[PDB]
Symmetry: C5
């Protein structure tokens, strides 16, 4: 369930591994922000 990894790059971008895939994006600022729907897909598997 949820993320396997969740962490920041030093430039303040949020990265996460979810369902073996890698995502990044600006971190959310309220629970109304669906982060995973807007996050940039940057790895399609293997994570």
């Amino acid at each position: 369930s949820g993320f396997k990894f969740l962490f920041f790059s030093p430039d303040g971008t949020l990265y996460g591994v979810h369902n073996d895939k890698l995502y990044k994006g600006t971190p959310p600022t309220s629970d109304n922000d669906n982060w995973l729907a807007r996050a940039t897909l940057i790895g399609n598997g293997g994570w």
Copy 2:
């Protein structure tokens, strides 16, 4: 407990607790109830 607990480079503490994502300035003593004051920035899926 928390599943993830980690800093942003601007020094904000982030944690995932009960599937929810929270941020806040880090607690400064054993009297500081972090979860009661942290900003809820995601509810579910974390």
Copy 3:
């Protein structure tokens, strides 16, 4: 046994969850340095 989380803040302070409690302190530079005995207790439970 040991810590559940152990990570840095961006100013160089070491943070750690140990026995569900949160601690912080300047990291040790030798194994003679009992870090947990000097660390600041910043959370008494729930971590």
Copy 4:
């Protein structure tokens, strides 16, 4: 997949995969096979 995955403060991605330590600039798109180009910086023991 990875056992650890994390940044160095200069912006380089580090990962432990199959006991090995790898680093490299993070991927920009899912067309980028990161593990295939990452620099192997440790062969075992991670």
Copy 5:
């Protein structure tokens, strides 16, 4: 086997928990760099 935690300080030093002990050092630069053999032991137990 391997490490329980592996992470950076903001000054670029690699830290690792290995067999309950805390180590630090410049990150390895190649597979010919035996890191654990040259890392600085900074904690002998409890991690």
